[PDB]
Structure 1
Amino acid sequence: TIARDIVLQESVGKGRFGEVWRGKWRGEEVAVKIFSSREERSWFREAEIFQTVMLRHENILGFIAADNKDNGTWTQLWLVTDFHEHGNLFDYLNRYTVTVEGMIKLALSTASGLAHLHMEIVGTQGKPAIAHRDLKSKNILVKKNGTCCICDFGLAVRHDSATDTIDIAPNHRVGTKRYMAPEVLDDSINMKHFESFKRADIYAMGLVFWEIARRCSIGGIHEDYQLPYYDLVPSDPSVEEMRKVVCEQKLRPNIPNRWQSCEALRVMAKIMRECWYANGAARLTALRIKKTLSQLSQQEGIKM
């Protein structure tokens, strides 16, 4: 219970569901996602995902509390989290270029958060695997230390490895069309196999890594900010437009020939290709991507 101890400052955005405000909790800046009684289901689902035992991780948005005022107003349901002044990765990459170190910090942090989300921990204080289903640069926040954290669990799915039960709402195609994996675009995805969701998140993470790498400046040389497929689909692409490029034409975002000249960009490009296979079962796992980027950061003396 926390809502009565928070002063709402200003609205900062609107999620898939709910409105996000910057607030102050006993002087500390917090983010508050507010929902009306009408979106009780989306509030309830996100609060449930956040309350998962052992989910806390520096690269997953820090949950503080969920509250219900039972007042019948637009401030009835609360989800209170940490506040990150920079906002999202999309805005960050539009404003700034990054150094090789900065790129590795953004990529490794995203992979670390997704590996934690995907990881099944067996025990008493155990953890079920979770898939995001809408990973994109607009759903990643940039912290003051230059690392990322994943947010917006409104479409997330939880697995029960014992009874094969998938906690899913809705049990159909969701997400941002631009970032949908080929198997999602062509309806071949096996919705009863939890691994399918993890594989689709990996494909989307590969597209986010391409967005970051384009902004990696070495001696002032870098690319302008673009969304994946900016050159191949119109703004707000339909499922048909995406299917033609991704499934039929087998196209992926172009990897600049100049990324082969830098070891960090070579490692990033190899990870992207191995996230992008049409065969989802051949893609890398988030844990393996995390450890590849961790080894590179360790050897190069990059500390997080």
Structure 2
Amino acid sequence: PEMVRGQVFDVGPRYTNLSYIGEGAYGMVCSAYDNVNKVRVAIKKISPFEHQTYCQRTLREIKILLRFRHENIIGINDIIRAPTIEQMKDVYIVQDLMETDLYKLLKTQHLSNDHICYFLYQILRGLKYIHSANVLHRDLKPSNLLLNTTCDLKICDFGLARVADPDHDHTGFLTEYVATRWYRAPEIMLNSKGYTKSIDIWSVGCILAEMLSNRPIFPGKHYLDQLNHILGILGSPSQEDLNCIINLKARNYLLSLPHKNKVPWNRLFPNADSKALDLLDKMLTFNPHKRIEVEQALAHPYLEQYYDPSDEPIAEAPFKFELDDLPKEKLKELIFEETARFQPG
């Protein structure tokens, strides 16, 4: 076992010469040389077994990604874990290594309008597949959009991904939320658990805006500041949209705010393609029921040079619907079972 930044990476001898990439609350990613396929790969060490929530998220991530196969989505190529539940302290997911991500690219590179268009196309093409499986990504952001030197784009990090559940989307005002703050749709702060597909379209909207200027459109500094930033650009919600917010705490907060008029997109993005801003507007709609869906976004005139629904595949086996109540110890068993197919035996 090699250390990487203090963590044992128990993946050798097949995977050697490890370099730290990044991490999260319960895992670390490294590049590693695969001594079999003779390529570098990405390896995520996941260490979730001391927390039910991280176990839930580990099982979803693995189960979702094992069902998916698509050019614009990062798959799982191998899973390393111990041969018995007793000896299993971590799980390692092996994935295609990509050169960079959109976060790093936007900090260093101006994107031509043709690159923005192609990137957005690829995002939406992968998202069409995800949504067609009845899955939500729920943490779409530039650092989760990987790229290689030929500008192929793949969506990664399904750690917050969930099967859609729109009948249980309602919650109260200021309900805590885990996904990355700057890409949260307004309704998260108002009345939404983020259990419908419209949550991901908002994030893609934010990504498109950020591609146009190299800067996050809504960099909220804290939870309610995120909504402040959204309403500064979109302006005050209409009576009709405000009437869809039935929770009094949320509604009366909105009614307490000074009036704001809509900032026209062509004012924030003077050099942008007019069709790009027309799609941007439709993705960054305040009311989630009125917000554009993934297949309509693909059909938008901005993407006319790429749109080809016959070459925009859907999932063969969508998710049909309960791991919420299960303890740490039973989810470990389910993770062990879910990963059994990759064992030598």
TM exceeding 0.5:
yes
Letter in 2 for 1:241: D
Q: Is the aligned partner of 1:77 residue 2:84?
A: no
- Structure 2, gaps ≥5 residues long: 1-9, 170-174, 236-261, 309-345
Cα RMSD for the two superposed structures = 3.2
Question: Sequence identity, in percent?
Answer: 21
Alpha-carbon shift at residue 103 of structure 1 (Å): 1.5
Map of 2:333 onto structure 1: none
Map of 1:122 onto structure 2: none
Alpha carbons 2:233, 2:263 under 8 Å: kept: no
Alpha carbons 1:56, 1:62 under 8 Å: kept: yes
Map of 1:113 onto structure 2: 126
Alpha-carbon shift at residue 172 of structure 1 (Å): 6.7
Alpha-carbon shift at residue 63 of structure 1 (Å): 1.9
Map of 1:240 onto structure 2: 224
- Structure 1, gaps ≥5 residues long: 120-127, 215-224, 300-304
Map of 1:221 onto structure 2: none
Distance 1:253 1:208 in 2: 18
* 1:184-230 alpha-carbon deviations (Å, 9 max, x no partner): 111x22x4xx8x5210110111010011122xxxxxxxxxx312224
Alpha-carbon shift at residue 244 of structure 1 (Å): 2.8
Matches within 5 A, 1:240-279: 240-247=224-231, 250-251=234-235, 255-257=265-267, 265-279=273-287
Matches within 5 A, 1:116-265: 116-119=129-132, 128-159=133-164, 173-186=177-190, 188-189=191-192, 191=193, 196-214=195-213, 225-230=214-219, 233=220, 237-247=221-231, 250-251=234-235, 255-257=265-267, 265=273
Map of 2:19 onto structure 1: 10
Letter in 2 for 1:149: K
Q: Give the direction of change, closer, same or farther, for the CA distance of 1:267–1:22 in structure 2 (3 Å limit).
A: same
* 1:92-119 alpha-carbon deviations (Å, 9 max, x no partner): 1111112222111111111111111101
Alpha carbons 1:211, 1:228 under 8 Å: kept: yes
Q: Give the direction of change, closer, same or farther, for the CA distance of 1:61–1:16 in structure 2 (3 Å limit).
A: farther
3-state DSSP of counterpart to 1:134? coil
Alpha carbons 2:299, 2:307 under 8 Å: kept: no
* 1:227-272 alpha-carbon deviations (Å, 9 max, x no partner): 2224xx4xxx22121223335874588734495776xx21211111
Alpha carbons 1:228, 1:253 under 8 Å: kept: no
Alpha-carbon shift at residue 137 of structure 1 (Å): 1.0
3-state DSSP of counterpart to 2:140? coil
Alpha carbons 1:107, 1:212 under 8 Å: kept: no
Q: Is the aligned partner of 1:31 residue 2:42?
A: yes
Map of 2:291 onto structure 1: 283
Alpha-carbon shift at residue 174 of structure 1 (Å): 2.5
Alpha-carbon shift at residue 90 of structure 1 (Å): 0.8
Alpha carbons 1:133, 1:174 under 8 Å: kept: no
Alpha-carbon shift at residue 10 of structure 1 (Å): 0.8
Distance 1:111 1:66 in 2: 28
Map of 1:217 onto structure 2: none
Q: Give the direction of change, closer, same or farther, for the CA distance of 1:160–1:67 in structure 2 (3 Å limit).
A: farther
1:45 to 57, 60, 73: 60
3-state DSSP of counterpart to 1:50? helix
Matches within 5 A, 1:59-98: 59-69=72-82, 76-86=90-100, 88-98=101-111
Distance 2:43 2:147 in 1: 17
Q: Give the direction of change, closer, same or farther, for the CA distance of 1:258–1:283 in structure 2 (3 Å limit).
A: closer
Q: Give the direction of change, closer, same or farther, for the CA distance of 1:101–1:72 in structure 2 (3 Å limit).
A: farther
From the CA coordinates, give the structure whose radius of gyration is larger: 2
Distance 1:73 1:42 in 2: 21
Alpha-carbon shift at residue 3 of structure 1 (Å): 4.4
